[PDB]
Amino acid sequence: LALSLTADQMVSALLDAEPPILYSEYDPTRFSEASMMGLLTNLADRELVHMINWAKRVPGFVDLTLHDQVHLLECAWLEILMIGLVWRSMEHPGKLLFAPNLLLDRNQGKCVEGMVEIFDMLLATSSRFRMMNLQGEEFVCLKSIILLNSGVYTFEKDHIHRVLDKITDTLIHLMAKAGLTLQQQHQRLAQLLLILSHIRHMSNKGMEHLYSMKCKNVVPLSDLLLEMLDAHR
Amino acid sequence: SLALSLTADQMVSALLDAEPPILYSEYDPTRPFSEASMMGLLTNLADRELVHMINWAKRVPGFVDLTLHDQVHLLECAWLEILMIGLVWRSMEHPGKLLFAPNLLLDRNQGKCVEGMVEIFDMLLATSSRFRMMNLQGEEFVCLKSIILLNSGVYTFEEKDHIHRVLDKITDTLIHLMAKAGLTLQQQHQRLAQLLLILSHIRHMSNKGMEHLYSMKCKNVVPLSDLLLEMLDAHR
Amino acid sequence: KILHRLLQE
Amino acid sequence: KILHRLLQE
Numbered sequence: 001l002a003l004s005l006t007a008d009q010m011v012s013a014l015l016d017a018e019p020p021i022l023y024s025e026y027d028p029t030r031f032s033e034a035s036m037m038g039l040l041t042n043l044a045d046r047e048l049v050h051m052i053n054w055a056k057r058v059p060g061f062v063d064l065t066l067h068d069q070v071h072l073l074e075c076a077w078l079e080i081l082m083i084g085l086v087w088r089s090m091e092h093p094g095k096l097l098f099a100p101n102l103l104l105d106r107n108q109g110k111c112v113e114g115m116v117e118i119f120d121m122l123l124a125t126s127s128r129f130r131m132m133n134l135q136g137e138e139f140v141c142l143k144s145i146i147l148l149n150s151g152v153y154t155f156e157k158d159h160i161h162r163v164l165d166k167i168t169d170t171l172i173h174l175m176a177k178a179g180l181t182l183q184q185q186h187q188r189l190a191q192l193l194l195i196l197s198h199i200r201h202m203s204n205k206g207m208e209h210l211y212s213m214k215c216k217n218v219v220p221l222s223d224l225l226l227e228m229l230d231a232h233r
Numbered sequence: 234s235l236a237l238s239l240t241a242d243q244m245v246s247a248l249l250d251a252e253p254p255i256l257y258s259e260y261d262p263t264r265p266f267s268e269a270s271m272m273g274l275l276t277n278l279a280d281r282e283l284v285h286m287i288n289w290a291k292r293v294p295g296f297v298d299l300t301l302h303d304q305v306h307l308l309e310c311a312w313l314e315i316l317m318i319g320l321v322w323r324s325m326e327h328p329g330k331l332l333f334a335p336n337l338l339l340d341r342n343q344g345k346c347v348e349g350m351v352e353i354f355d356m357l358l359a360t361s362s363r364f365r366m367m368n369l370q371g372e373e374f375v376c377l378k379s380i381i382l383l384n385s386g387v388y389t390f391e392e393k394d395h396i397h398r399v400l401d402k403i404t405d406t407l408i409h410l411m412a413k414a415g416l417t418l419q420q421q422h423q424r425l426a427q428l429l430l431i432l433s434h435i436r437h438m439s440n441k442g443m444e445h446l447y448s449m450k451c452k453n454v455v456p457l458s459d460l461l462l463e464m465l466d467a468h469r
Numbered sequence: 470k471i472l473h474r475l476l477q478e
Numbered sequence: 479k480i481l482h483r484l485l486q487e
């Protein structure tokens with residue numbers, strides 16, 4: 001029934017599907033390199049469990065075979081965690097809101113080797129969202145696009161592309177509703193989708209970094225996390 | 234102005250005019266391929282294409298308005314994406330193959346000759362398949378290629394505002410092309426989205442190709458030119 | 470795979 | 479940097 005949804009219904013479905021914002025186990029009276037990476041990976045693992053439930057609620061997703069669902073999630077999981085992070089951080093210039101009780105400044109990225117470069121990319125994306133005044137309704141559309149798009153060529157396809165078109169229709173509906181002219185709608189749609197290229201880039205860099213932490217056998221990664229990482233070789 | 238003063242038709246004409254030539258590889262059919270010799274052909278080719286790319290970039294409206302440091306940054310960020318989209322475009326009329334050069338048309342089985350390369354070939358072939366599925370047009374291709382140049386490094390930066398104004402102009406241009414082609418208003422935004430979403434896949438392939446090239450360099454498989462070495466080093 | 474298991478259960 | 483020089487030619 002995904003292809004039968006109206007724009008307003010798609011928006012409502014995606015807003016309702018949203019995962020909860022999780023807290024860190026961080027104790028504000030305690031950082032070290034091992035400490036910080038442990039907090040981030042612990043949080044990432046818990047977010048992943050909720051991401052799986054969310055994906056099942058994205059219209060069209062459970063129409064796919066289990067194998068195709070697995071493939072899409074394996075491809076997109078870090079992109080999805082990152083766009084979520086960027087969104088939460090949008091109102092905190094210069095900071096990344098990993099959790100309400102774990103709001104990190106750019107410089108704390110240095111507590112972990114190679115992390116600040118990734119932090120800077122995430123912060124620049126947050127700034128762009130701020131620059132564009134990205135709306136919550138737009139954000140949820142973009143996040144579903146990442147889920148359906150990222151692994152779609154690594155393949156079913158026809159249905160996925162029709163669902164993607166419906167999400168495009170929904171983004172455009174939101175812009176028209178907001179009073180943008182046709183020219184402004186097309187420009188903004190393009191601006192939003194071009195951010196997805198940057199998010200792909202950040203995920204690939206983050207995956208390299210993560211694989212590096214996994215080899216320097218120090219920070220423990222959950223079994224789920226290790227499998228998600230392994231899917232990228 | 235002057236880039237921002239262009240009409241859609243003038244934008245298309247400038248980009249089409251700026252297009253680099255299709256170059257030949259140094260392929261020698263007298264000897265069998267080895268990992269080293271196949272990689273050597275691709276890196277030698279990339280190096281010669283890079284010189285033409287640099288001169289193409291200078292002809293993309295808006296690019297030469299940037300400082301040299303910013304021009305360097307954008308090309309450093311986008312070069313492999315740009316080579317790859319060009320390869321995928323050349324390859325459209327050759328299902329199952331990659332037309333690296335007119336004298337170098339390779340299938341995935343030949344890609345296996347280089348360790349780790351077949352995975353990249355498979356992604357490029359899937360992208361070429363997607364272009365065919367979408368019936369990508371030459372005018373659309375040149376717009377996408379310029380978007381890559383201007384977009385890929387833009388969030389690693391006034392200068393920025395200038396770039397976004399140019400990017401908006403290219404969006405207007407894509408839409409104009411599609412409308413002139415008879416697409417409905419809804420088909421226009423749908424196709425604009427389909428085209429731009431491919432750029433996510435192109436970024437991914439570039440990142441994987443960059444990792445692979447770094448691996449070849451770190452294993453001394455082939456000697457990279459100073460230019461290639463510096464373009465690669467920009468990616469850490 | 471664990472992911473396989475979460476997508477069903 | 480070589481690219482820097484090549485951009486000026």
Ligand SMILES: CCCOC(=O)c1ccc(O)cc1
Pocket residue numbers: 040041043044047081082084085098206210
């Ligand atoms: C597995 C990577 C952990 O560090 C992150 O980059 C991270 C963690 C949690 C998030 O929501 C986003 C990123």
Ligand SMILES: CCCOC(=O)c1ccc(O)cc1
Pocket residue numbers: 275276278279282316317319320333442446
């Ligand atoms: C840089 C090593 C890999 O080369 C390529 O992937 C390649 C080379 C030339 C092209 O036009 C496209 C891709």
